Amino acid sequence: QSRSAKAGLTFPVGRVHRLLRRGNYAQRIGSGAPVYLTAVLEYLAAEILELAGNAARDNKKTRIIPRHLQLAIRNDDELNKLLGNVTIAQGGVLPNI
DNA sequence: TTTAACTTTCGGAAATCAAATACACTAATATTAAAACGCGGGGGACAGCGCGTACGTGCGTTTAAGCGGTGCTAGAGCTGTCTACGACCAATTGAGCGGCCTCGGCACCATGTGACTTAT
After folding, report:
1. Which residues neighbour A53 within 8 Å (Cβ) at sequence distance 6 or greater?
2. Which of A21, A24, A56, A81 is the one with CA 20 to 30 A from A65?
């Protein structure tokens, strides 16, 4: 058995734990912190990737592309607050009317 | 063949339990600095306009941009190996403010000897 396996999360929480270790965020790394934040990250990735799926459906290209990613993330009004100053590579910009 | 997760522990952390302040607010109070009603105003900001203008709008001949070979070498990234350098321990200090003391100087009772005296 593995900690990354029993976590039931895609991203390996062991990697997150040791990243927190070398990241100097504190002297001890609470074992629930990496798994919790890994799950939060996985949900946010799920948001981006269900947007990817429906953008692939809308644009008829089965595999998601950065244009679709930029368009969907810029249409995500609440998420743009998190990613306001953020910008995406090769994504262009959403059309202004 | 190399990035992990078992573990096998343990000694600082992060809970707990507690009382010591102490601070916030919920609140009376007459005052009283600013609010907010209330009418003109200037002043200005927008309606409407002429015609000048300035950036597109449109052709000719250029120019660079883009490839497309032709090296070649400067670093990429990696050093395999020697320290240095800093993280730990501790000693190696120290200074500052209480502690004892201990200086010498007073007031007071003890002790011996020089008068002298007397009854030896």
Report:
1. A64
2. A81
Per the entry, the structure determination technique was cryo-EM
The number of C-alpha atoms within 13 Å of A28 and in the hemisphere containing its C-beta is 3
Residue A93 within a domain: no
The total of other beta-carbon atoms located within 10 Å of residue A20's CB is 17
The DSSP symbol for A7 reads T
Q: What nucleotides of chain B have any atom within 7 angstroms of a protein Cβ? A: 3-6, 13-14
Residues around strand B, C-beta < 7 Å? A 1-4, 6, 12, 14-15, 17-18, 27-28
| Angstrom distance (rounded) from CA A52 to CA A47 | 8
Report CA(A2)–C1'(B19) in Å, whole number.
48
Domain that holds residue A30: 1-86
Residue A30, sorted as left (phi over 0), alpha (psi -120 to 50) or beta, turns out to be beta
Angle A26-A30-A33 from CA coordinates, rounded to 5°: 100
